[PDB]
Amino acid sequence: ADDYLQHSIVPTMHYQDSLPRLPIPKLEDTMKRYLNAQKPLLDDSQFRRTEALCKNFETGVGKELHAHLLAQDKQNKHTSYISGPWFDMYLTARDSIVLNFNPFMAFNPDPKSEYNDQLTRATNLTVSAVRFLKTLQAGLLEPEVFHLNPSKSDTDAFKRLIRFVPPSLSWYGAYLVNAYPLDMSQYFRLFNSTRIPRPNRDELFTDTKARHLLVLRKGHFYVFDVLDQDGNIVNPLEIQAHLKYILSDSSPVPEFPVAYLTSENRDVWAELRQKLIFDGNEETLKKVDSAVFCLCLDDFPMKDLIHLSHTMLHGDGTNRWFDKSFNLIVAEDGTAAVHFEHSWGDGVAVLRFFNEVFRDSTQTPAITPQSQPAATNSSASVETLSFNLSGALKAGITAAKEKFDTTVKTLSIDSIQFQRGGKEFLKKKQLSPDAVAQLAFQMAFLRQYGQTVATYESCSTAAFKHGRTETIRPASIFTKRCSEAFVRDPSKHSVGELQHMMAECSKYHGQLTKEATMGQGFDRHLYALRYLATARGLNLPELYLDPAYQQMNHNILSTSTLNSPAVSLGGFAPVVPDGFGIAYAVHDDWIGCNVSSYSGRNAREFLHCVQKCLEDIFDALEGKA
Ligand SMILES: CCCCCCCCCCCC
Numbered sequence: 287a288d289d290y291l292q293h294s295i296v297p298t299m300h301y302q303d304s305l306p307r308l309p310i311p312k313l314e315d316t317m318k319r320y321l322n323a324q325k326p327l328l329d330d331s332q333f334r335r336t337e338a339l340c341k342n343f344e345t346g347v348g349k350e351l352h353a354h355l356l357a358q359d360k361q362n363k364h365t366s367y368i369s370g371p372w373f374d375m376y377l378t379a380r381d382s383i384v385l386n387f388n389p390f391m392a393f394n395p396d397p398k399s400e401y402n403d404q405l406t407r408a409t410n411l412t413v414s415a416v417r418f419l420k421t422l423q424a425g426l427l428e429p430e431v432f433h434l435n436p437s438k439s440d441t442d443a444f445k446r447l448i449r450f451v452p453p454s455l456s457w458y459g460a461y462l463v464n465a466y467p468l469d470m471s472q473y474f475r476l477f478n479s480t481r482i483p484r485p486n487r488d489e490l491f492t493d494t495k496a497r498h499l500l501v502l503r504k505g506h507f508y509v510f511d512v513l514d515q516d517g518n519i520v521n522p523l524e525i526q527a528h529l530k531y532i533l534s535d536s537s538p539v540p541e542f543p544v545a546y547l548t549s550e551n552r553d554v555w556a557e558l559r560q561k562l563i564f565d566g567n568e569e570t571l572k573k574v575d576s577a578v579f580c581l582c583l584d585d586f587p588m589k590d591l592i593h594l595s596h597t598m599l600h601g602d603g604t605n606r607w608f609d610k611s612f613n614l615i616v617a618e619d620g621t622a623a624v625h626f627e628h629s630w631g632d633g634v635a636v637l638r639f640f641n642e643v644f645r646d647s648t649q650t651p652a653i654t655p656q657s658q659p660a661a662t663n664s665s666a667s668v669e670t671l672s673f674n675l676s677g678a679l680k681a682g683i684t685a686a687k688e689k690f691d692t693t694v695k696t697l698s699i700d701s702i703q704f705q706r707g708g709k710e711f712l713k714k715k716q717l718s719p720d721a722v723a724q725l726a727f728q729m730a731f732l733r734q735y736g737q738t739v740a741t742y743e744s745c746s747t748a749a750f751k752h753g754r755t756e757t758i759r760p761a762s763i764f765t766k767r768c769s770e771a772f773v774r775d776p777s778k779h780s781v782g783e784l785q786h787m788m789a790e791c792s793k794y795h796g797q798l799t800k801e802a803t804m805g806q807g808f809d810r811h812l813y814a815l816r817y818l819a820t821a822r823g824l825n826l827p828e829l830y831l832d833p834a835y836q837q838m839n840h841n842i843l844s845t846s847t848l849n850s851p852a853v854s855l856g857g858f859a860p861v862v863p864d865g866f867g868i869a870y871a872v873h874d875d876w877i878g879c880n881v882s883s884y885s886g887r888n889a890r891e892f893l894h895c896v897q898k899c900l901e902d903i904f905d906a907l908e909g910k911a
C-alpha cells in the first residue's frame with residue numbers, strides 16, 4: 287500500500303561498515319602477471335626489453351612507489367586505493383562522453399504486448415523508477431549480495447538473523463553462509479545527479495531535495511513533479527496525464543537543440559555552460575541538473591536491432607541529456623532502454639536499478655493501457671524550459687552538432703545470436719562459458735586480421751569497501767596457441783588435441799577471473815603506482831614509457847558480459863579508433879553478442895567470424911573434426 291517496490295528486513299546499507307578492504311597485490315606478483323599478459327603480444331626482442339624494465343622497476347622506483355602506495359592506503363582505510371584515482375581519470379578526461387564512455391542497456395518488452403504502448407510504458411517505467419528511488423532512500427532496498435548458494439543464504443531465515451548483527455560484524459555473518467555483500471556507496475548517484483563540465487576536471491553534482499522529472503521530446507525540455515512535498519509519489523494517473531500532454535505537443539524541433547552541447551569536448555562545453563549562465567540561464571540549468579533523472583520520449587519506432595543500438599547508444603543528438611546520471615528512453619513502439627553517464631560509477635547500481643524496475647513495471651504496473659488520465663491542468667503542472675541563446679551559443683550548438691554527426695557517422699554496430707548452444711552444453715563439457723566466448727573473440731580476430739591484440743574484459747571488485755573494477759586479460763599463451771591451431775593448422779591437430787587446448791584456455795581464464803575479483807589483477811595496481819608518481823611530481827618511470835605498456839593499454843578488443851532476464855540488448859562504442867566494443871551474454875542455450883566498430887574495423891565481418899569460430903568450437907567439443 288506504499289510507494290516502495292521492496293521491503294527489506296535488512297537495512298540496505300547493513301553490510302557497508304564491515305566490507306573487507308581492497309587488497310593491494312605484492313609488487314612481485316603484479317610484475318609477473320604483467321609479463322604473463324605480455325607473452326602473447328610481444329616478439330622475443332620486445333619481451334626481453336620489457337622483462338628488463340620490469341626487473342629494474344621492481345627493485346628501483348617501482349619498489350619505492352609501492353611503499354608510498356601502501357603507506358597511503360593505511361592512512362585511508364575507509365576507502366580503496368583505486369577509487370579516487372579512477373574517478374579522477376574519468377572526470378579529468380576531456381573527450382566527448384558519448385561513444386567514448388557512455389554505454390546503454392535495453393529492456394526486454396513487457397511480456398504483455400498491449401503494455402508496450404509508449405504512454406503506458408513511459409508511465410509505468412517512470413513510476414517504478416521513482417518507487418526505486420523511494421525504496422533506496424528509505425533503506426528498504428535489499429542489500430546487494432552475491433550468493434554462491436542462494437537457496438541457503440538468500441532466505442528469510444538468514445535475513446531474520448543477520449538483521450540483529452551490528453553493521454561492524456554483519457559482513458562475517460554473510461561470509462559464513464558463502465554470501466558476499468557488495469559495495470553500495472555509488473547507488474545514491476542514480477538520482478538527482480549529473481556531471482557538470484568544468485575547466486580542468488568535471489564535477490559530480492547531486493541535489494537530493496529536488497522532486498521533479500526532466501522529460502525530453504523533440505529536443506524540448508519539460509519538468510513536472512513526480513514526488514510531492516509530502517514525499518509521496520504523484521498519482522500515476524496524473525503522471526500519465528502530464529506525459530500525454532508532452533506527447534501531444536506539436537511544436538517542431540528547435541533550430542538549435544541545446545542537448546547537443548552535452549556531447550561536446552568537456553572544455554568546450556564547460557565554457558559554453560559558463561556563457562549560458564552569464565546569459566541568464568542558471569535557473570533553467572539548475573532544474574535540468576537536479577531532476578530525479580531524464581526521461582526521453584522518441585517519436586519513432588525501432589526499425590531493427592541495429593537502429594535500436596544506435597538510438598540508445600547515441601541517438602540523433604537532440605533528445606538526450608548525456609550528462610545526467612542516466613537517461614530512460616522510451617520509443618514510439620514502447621522499446622525502452624537506459625543510457626547512462628559512465629564517470630559516476632561502475633554500473634552495478636544501474637543494473638540493480640534496471641532489474642528492479644523491469645520486474646516492478648511488468649509484474650505490478652502502475653497503470654494499464656485502458657487507464658484514464660486523471661483530470662488536471664497539465665499546462666500548469668508541466669513547465670516548458672526555455673534557453674536564452676546568444677549568437678555565440680547558437681554557433682556553439684551548430685559546432686557541437688557537426689562534431690557529433692561527424693563522429694557518429696563512423697560508428698557501426700551489429701549483433702548475432704548463436705543458437706546451437708550455451709552454458710548448458712559448455713558446462714557439460716566442463717568448460718567455462720565465459721572462457722569459451724573470449725576464446726572465440728581471439729580466434730575470430732586472428733582469422734579476420736591475422737594477429738593477437740590487447741584484450742580487455744571488465745570484472746568487478748565490488749566485494750570490497752569502495753571496490754570498483756579490475757581488468758581480466760583474456761588474451762593468453764593458451765588462447766593464442768588454441769586459436770592458431772583452429773585457424774592456421776586445422777587437420778594437423780586431432781580433435782582430442784583441440785579439446786585439451788580449449789580446456790587449457792578455460793582453466794587459465796578461470797584463474798584470472800578469480801584473481802581479478804579478488805583484486806589480484808595487475809592493471810589497477812600498475813595504474814595506481816603511475817598516478818602516485820605523477821602526483822609526486824616525479825618523472826614517469828621507464829616501465830610506462832615502454833611501447834609495450836602503451837600497447838597493453840590500447841585495447842583493440844574491449845569486452846564486458848551482461849547477464850540479466852531484464853536485458854534484451856546492450857552495447858558500447860570501441861575504446862580506441864581501431865578497436866571493437868564487445869558486449870556479450872552466454873545464455874543457457876544460446877550466445878549473443880552486440881559489437882561496435884569505427885571505420886577502421888568491420889563489426890559485421892568480425893561477427894561472421896565469431897559465428898564461424900563458435901561453430902568450430904562446438905564441433906570439436908562434440909568429437910567432430
Ligand atoms: C564477488 C563478485 C561480485 C560481482 C557482482 C556483480 C557485478 C555485475 C557488474 C555489472 C555491470 C553492468
Ligand SMILES: CCCCCCCCCCCC
Pocket residue numbers: 389742743744839841844845846858861
Ligand atoms: C561499459 C562497458 C565497458 C567495457 C570495458 C571497457 C574498458 C576500457 C578501459 C580503458 C582504460 C584506458
Ligand SMILES: CCCCCCCCCCCC
Pocket residue numbers: 591701702703847848853854855856857869870871877878879880
Ligand atoms: C532477442 C533480443 C535481442 C538479442 C540480440 C542478441 C544479443 C546481443 C548482445 C547482448 C549483450 C548484453
